[PDB]
Copies of this chain bind each other. A is one copy, B any other.
Amino acid sequence: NFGTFS
């Protein structure tokens, strides 16, 4: 995927 921002 592209990714995750948390």
Contact = CB atoms under 8 A, between A and B. Distances in A.
Interface residues of A, number: 6
A2 B4 CA distance: 9
Given A1-B3, A3-B4, 12 more contacts: A1-B1, A1-B2, A2-B2, A2-B3, A3-B3, A3-B5, A4-B4, A4-B5, A4-B6, A5-B5, A5-B6, A6-B6
A6 B1 CA distance: 13
Contacts of A4: 3-6
A1 B3 CA distance: 6
A4 B1 CA distance: 9
A1 to B, nearest CB: 5
